[PDB]
Amino acid sequence: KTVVVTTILESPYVMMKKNHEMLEGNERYEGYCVDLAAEIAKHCGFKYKLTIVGDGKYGARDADTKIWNGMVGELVYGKADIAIAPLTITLVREEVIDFSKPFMSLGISIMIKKGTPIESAEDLSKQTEIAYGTLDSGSTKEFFRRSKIAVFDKMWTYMRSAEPSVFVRTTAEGVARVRKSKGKYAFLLESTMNEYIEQRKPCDTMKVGGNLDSKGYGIATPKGSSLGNAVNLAVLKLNEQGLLDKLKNKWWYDKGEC
Amino acid sequence: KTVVVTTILESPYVMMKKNHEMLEGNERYEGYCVDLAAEIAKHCGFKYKLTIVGDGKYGARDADTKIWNGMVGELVYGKADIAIAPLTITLVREEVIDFSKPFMSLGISIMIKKGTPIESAEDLSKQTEIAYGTLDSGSTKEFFRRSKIAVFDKMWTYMRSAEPSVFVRTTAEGVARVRKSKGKYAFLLESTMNEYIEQRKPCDTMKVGGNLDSKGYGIATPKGSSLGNAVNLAVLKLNEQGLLDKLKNKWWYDKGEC
Ligand SMILES: N[C@@H](Cc1onc(O)c1Br)C(=O)O
Numbered sequence: 001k002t003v004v005v006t007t008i009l010e011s012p013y014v015m016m017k018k019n020h021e022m023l024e025g026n027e028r029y030e031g032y033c034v035d036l037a038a039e040i041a042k043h044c045g046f047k048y049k050l051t052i053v054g055d056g057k058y059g060a061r062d063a064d065t066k067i068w069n070g071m072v073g074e075l076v077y078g079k080a081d082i083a084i085a086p087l088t089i090t091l092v093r094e095e096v097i098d099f100s101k102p103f104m105s106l107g108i109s110i111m112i113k114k115g116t117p118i119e120s121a122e123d124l125s126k127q128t129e130i131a132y133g134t135l136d137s138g139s140t141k142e143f144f145r146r147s148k149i150a151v152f153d154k155m156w157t158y159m160r161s162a163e164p165s166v167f168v169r170t171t172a173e174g175v176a177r178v179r180k181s182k183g184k185y186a187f188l189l190e191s192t193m194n195e196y197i198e199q200r201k202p203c204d205t206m207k208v209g210g211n212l213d214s215k216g217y218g219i220a221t222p223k224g225s226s227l228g229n230a231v232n233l234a235v236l237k238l239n240e241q242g243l244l245d246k247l248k249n250k251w252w253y254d255k256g257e258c
Numbered sequence: 259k260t261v262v263v264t265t266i267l268e269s270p271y272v273m274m275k276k277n278h279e280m281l282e283g284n285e286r287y288e289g290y291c292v293d294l295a296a297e298i299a300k301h302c303g304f305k306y307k308l309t310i311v312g313d314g315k316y317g318a319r320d321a322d323t324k325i326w327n328g329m330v331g332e333l334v335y336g337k338a339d340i341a342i343a344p345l346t347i348t349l350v351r352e353e354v355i356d357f358s359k360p361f362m363s364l365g366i367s368i369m370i371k372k373g374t375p376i377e378s379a380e381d382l383s384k385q386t387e388i389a390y391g392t393l394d395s396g397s398t399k400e401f402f403r404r405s406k407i408a409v410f411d412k413m414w415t416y417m418r419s420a421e422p423s424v425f426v427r428t429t430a431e432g433v434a435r436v437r438k439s440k441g442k443y444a445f446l447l448e449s450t451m452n453e454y455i456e457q458r459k460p461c462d463t464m465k466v467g468g469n470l471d472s473k474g475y476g477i478a479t480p481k482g483s484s485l486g487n488a489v490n491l492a493v494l495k496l497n498e499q500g501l502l503d504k505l506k507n508k509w510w511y512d513k514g515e516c
């Protein structure tokens with residue numbers, strides 16, 4: 001049967017085409033993950049329907065209700081057959097859903113407005129003049145919340161009680177905050193998005209320092225799903241064929257605006 | 259039996275005493291509503307236990323699940339017997355819980371950092387240099403979201419799509435945002451809180467213009483609760499005795515710091 005794909009609106013992975021009001025179904029979307037989905041489907045021999053996750057979240061378990069939300073939840077509760085998006089492979093998630101080998105590598109990074117006197121996480125941790133935060137949900141927020149590393153623990157201690165809140169709901173919001181804060185806000189986000197934004201007008205942001213960690217995005221399926229094996233092989237095959245690199249250049253650098 | 263009172267941490271209505279770690283039960287709290295609760299209890303002849311609402315919300319119904327949250331939810335689902343807090347009397351709430359006649363009047367107002375070139379809601383609506391927002395929940399946010407009045411509709415249209423978000427989770431956060439935004443953020447909140455903050459150090463904020471609307475706070479009880487009649491009479495009696503005015507001066511002006 002037709003495979004239900006859950007994804008999320010996150011540039012340049014999945015974006016609404018400017019003329020989406022004129023289009024229907026899968027044709028409404030474009031981006032790295034839209035292209036990858038087509039490639040995976042072709043190599044696994046299935047037809048599919050792209051759907052945007054209802055709550056706009058990646059996936060976390062509520063500590064109280066213990067209910068999974070986001071794309072992970074969609075897979076766990078059987079609402080979708082596969083998730084093709086910038087979904088970070090983490091221990092807690094790996095325990096409830098199946099992940100293909102990573103199709104892209106990344107690490108947490110720092111985004112600053114050009115000219116901000118910050119070069120590293122250590123720099124940020126030792127001052128308060130420049131506020132800094134992360135998305136209000138997701139693996140980056142959790143990285144800091146759970147970290148036992150001195151510098152990161154110090155940063156989380158600051159972030160969790162900073163007022164006003166240093167957390168943002170979407171990447172777009174964090175970028176807007178960096179751009180409109182006159183250098184007084186630094187955004188902690190995954191290197192992939194940071195690198196993409198650095199090449200977008202008004203070209204006033206930049207990624208600074210090295211990544212704080214190293215991980216990857218994986219295609220996810222419900223635990224035990226028979227689709228898992230085929231998808232994993234397709235990811236490895238596409239990587240070996242250079243297709244993944246081609247898609248990266250296509251959506252990040254080929255049409256960079258800076 | 260002992261009456262379970264649900265309330266919320268909102269200065270100067272209910273605040274944790276600085277040495278609360280040394281205290282137990284009702285003695286941990288102080289404020290206008292803590293004093294009012296004692297007065298109402300005495301005049302209604304009941305003993306009570308103050309409890310802080312679990313989700314820290316005032317009360318709204320989820321459009322999807324249709325479940326009430328906040329203090330209103332606590333009353334609707336029988337978790338508390340009465341709510342004594344700065345709970346705004348609104349049509350939607352009046353339909354699900356009982357409200358005493360108002361114990362305090364108020365209106366939505368504008369808080370600015372001293373020196374901000376804004377004198378009214380109209381001023382705010384006609385510009386974008388100075389961002390402005392409200393709490394991310396509650397009657398003030400709903401006032402703008404539902405308003406059919408031109409100026410307020412224009413303001414909501416701006417607020418709902420402004421990036422980064424102009425909404426804050428708590429009053430403290432909004433105040434912090436006004437104070438740290440160098441005049442680039444104006445906070446829309448109820449006049450009562452605005453007036454209180456204006457008299458608190460560092461004395462860098464002020465209420466400007468008249469109130470946008472007029473309403474009041476009421477003591478709430480589960481719909482049909484027998485406690486409702488007594489509480490309403492106590493509110494009227496306390497007002498006529500001048501007790502409510504005395505409490506207002508006690509928590510707002512007597513010890514003003516500006
Ligand atoms: N990939 C993360 C989400 C995320 O975490 N930090 C960001 O900037 C973004 Br987008 C996840 O899967 O939770």
Ligand SMILES: N[C@@H](Cc1onc(O)c1Br)C(=O)O
Nearest residue numbers: 316345346396397398447448
């Ligand atoms: N009193 C309101 C909450 C509220 O609405 N605007 C504020 O500043 C505050 Br506090 C309510 O009962 O929803």
